[PDB]
Design goal:
The structure is a homodimer.
Chain A: H1 3-20, H2 26-44
Helix pairs in contact in A: 1-2
Protein name (chain B): Integrase [Bacteriophage A118]
Organism (chain B): Listeria innocua serovar 6a (strain ATCC BAA-680 / CLIP 11262)
């Protein structure tokens, strides 16, 4: 399930893509991006330990 | 209708810059897409040369 990390990271590149094209605002991007970053940490740690 | 692509890129550039002034996020994340955004502005300029 290391792929999921790329998938969660792939979602990050896209989430930036959307905002840059105006589909998502800054205020939203705050909540949505940190959710991913947390989801990564949620899946980043205590699996390679 | 290739002339009016830079204004979109500038809008694409602005939005991105609003994340820097917002202050959060990692700058290296924002630098990778800016490298693509700045470059796309470059070609639109360069095509006018010839």
């Amino acid at each position: 399930l290391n792929e999921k990390l790329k998938i969660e990271h792939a979602k990050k590149k896209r989430l930036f893509d959307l905002y840059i094209n105006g589909s998502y605002e800054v205020s939203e991007l705050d909540s949505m991006m940190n959710d991913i970053d947390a989801q990564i940490n949620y899946y980043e740690a205590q699996i390679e330990a």
